Amino acid sequence: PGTVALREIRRYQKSTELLIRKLPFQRLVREIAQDFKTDLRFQSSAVMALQEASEAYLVGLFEDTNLCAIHAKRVTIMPKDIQLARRIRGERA
Template identity: 70%
Template structure:
């Protein structure tokens, strides 16, 4: 459908409204690559749980933990120095303790017919473990 004087006419209609031109934002959305859809929070959380359960590395960062240990030691007595091996062992023990505490907390929440842990679950888990660190909560 080429005319000598005109550009090609793609859509010849027999009347009615002319087709609307797309806005620039709509055209940009169509041109952009698809991101794979909407991410559901539950699916992402389950994927993270699987990833962290498979991994064996410690999740507490080294330098912030080292600073925390130094700060606590400074409150007790000044002049302490720490080698990296004892701090690593302490970091491993703290992470193991916290994971076990959260496991017990989750069991307390499940016992209360809930899936979301609450502060009262952690308090109960601490009491069942002996309660000598209950004042930290």
């Protein structure tokens, strides 16, 4: 329902904390690093830097996605919005 949604926007927009649990993220980084070089170790701050940048990247993406969703007539964001945003952003997989 609309009221809780906005209430959540308001609260999480006022927030400054990392929204993903530290551990799961760290694992994702290790489980990725292993491809490029098997004997790799990341300092905790280096991992931290990645999360700060990762979540920053994502909200920024979300904002743009939101603008696309609204561009039609919707309030609900679909994959096609993330894609249209990333497209115009020049991003690629």
